[PDB]
Every structure is written in structure tokens, then in C-alpha cells.
């Protein structure tokens, strides 16, 4: 009713083409096909066997329209270190979420320390069920609120530090 969507990964026509740093070997676009053969465009990284990971993935520029306070809803799934065969002392079961406020919608190389940290996201009590035909994905669902924003728009970023993450859906919205 009063929700205005500022970004929905599930609705974007074609590739997301967010920005992965690193560009190869970190976050990669993986397409899970729903019953109609419509891509569901996920972002995944699972280098749990390999130390000192620092993999970033950021969105396109997102306009805030009028709003100071935005809401971020992520549906994801994490492989617990417990369930992954291998000796892996640097395995992790969270990722970090960041934002960068910019008037410039073609920011190219925004640096790590310009990003401002929202939270560490973990698989927790809340989940959802997304029926895609052949399967039902059971996924974690977390929402965070960021603000107060005061620039034409912003960038979201997800940092991986040694986890096995699938980000299946990212919606960003505000309440009008």
C-alpha cells in the first residue's frame, strides 16, 4: 500500500551486472530458473577453503526519491561450516552489509573505507518459502532499516569474509 520499491533484483530485466570486487573468483551471478524459465538472478560466493577473504559486491546507484529512511529486505541461504566437508578454520556463517551515500549515479571506484556499515547478517529465526515449481526454496529473510539519508541516492554493498552465501533476492524500499 504505502511501500515504494527503489530496487528489486527479481524484477530487473536482463543481467544485474552489479560490481564485483574482485571481478573474477569472488561474487558471481548465478541464474536459478523458475517454472516459466525466467532467470532468478542470484549472487553467490563460496571460497570457504581459502584464507583472508574480502569479497565485495555493490549495487548500481539507487535513488532515494524523497525518503530519508529506506528498508532493505534480503532473502538468502548460507551453508553452515558444520555441513561443508573440509578442514577450514576461516569459514564464516555471516556476511556484512554496507551503504555509500552519493549524488553521483556513475561512481566507478568507490573505496572500502567510504562504505558505512549497516549490520552483520546471519541466518537467524526468520525464513520464507519461494515456490519455483520443481522445488521450494526455503531461505533466510532479513530486513534492515538504513537512514537518515541526505543525498540524491546511494549504493548498497555486501562483503564476504569466508562464507558460503547465496543472495537470492534484494529488495529496497521506503514507506510513502
Amino acid at each position: 500500500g504505502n511501500e515504494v520499491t527503489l530496487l528489486d533484483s527479481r524484477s530487473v530485466q536482463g543481467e544485474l551486472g552489479w560490481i564485483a570486487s574482485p571481478l573474477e573468483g569472488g561474487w558471481e551471478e548465478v541464474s536459478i530458473m523458475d517454472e516459466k524459465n525466467t532467470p532468478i538472478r542470484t549472487y553467490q560466493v563460496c571460497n570457504v577453503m581459502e584464507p583472508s577473504q574480502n569479497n565485495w559486491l555493490r549495487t548500481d546507484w539507487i535513488t532515494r526519491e524523497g525518503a530519508q529512511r529506506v528498508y532493505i529486505e534480503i532473502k538468502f541461504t548460507l551453508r553452515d561450516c558444520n555441513s561443508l566437508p573440509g578442514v577450514m578454520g576461516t569459514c564464516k556463517e555471516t556476511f556484512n552489509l554496507y551503504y555509500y551515500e552519493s549524488d553521483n549515479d556513475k561512481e566507478r571506484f568507490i573505496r572500502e573505507n567510504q562504505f558505512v556499515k549497516i549490520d552483520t547478517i546471519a541466518a537467524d529465526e526468520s525464513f520464507t518459502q519461494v515456490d519455483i515449481g520443481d522445488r521450494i526454496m526455503k531461505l533466510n529473510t532479513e530486513i534492515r532499516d538504513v537512514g537518515p539519508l541526505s543525498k540524491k541516492g546511494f549504493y548498497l554493498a555486501f562483503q564476504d569474509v569466508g562464507a558460503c552465501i547465496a543472495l537470492v533476492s534484494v529488495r529496497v524500499f521506503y514507506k510513502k
Partner: peptide
């Protein structure tokens, strides 16, 4: 490569 890939279920 990724050790595991989420496709429906995780595949490692």
C-alpha cells in the same frame, strides 16, 4: 571455483 553452488539445493 566455488566449492558449493546453490541451484533449489546446495550442490558441493
Amino acid at each position: 571455483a566455488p566449492y558449493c553452488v546453490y541451484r533449489x539445493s546446495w550442490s558441493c
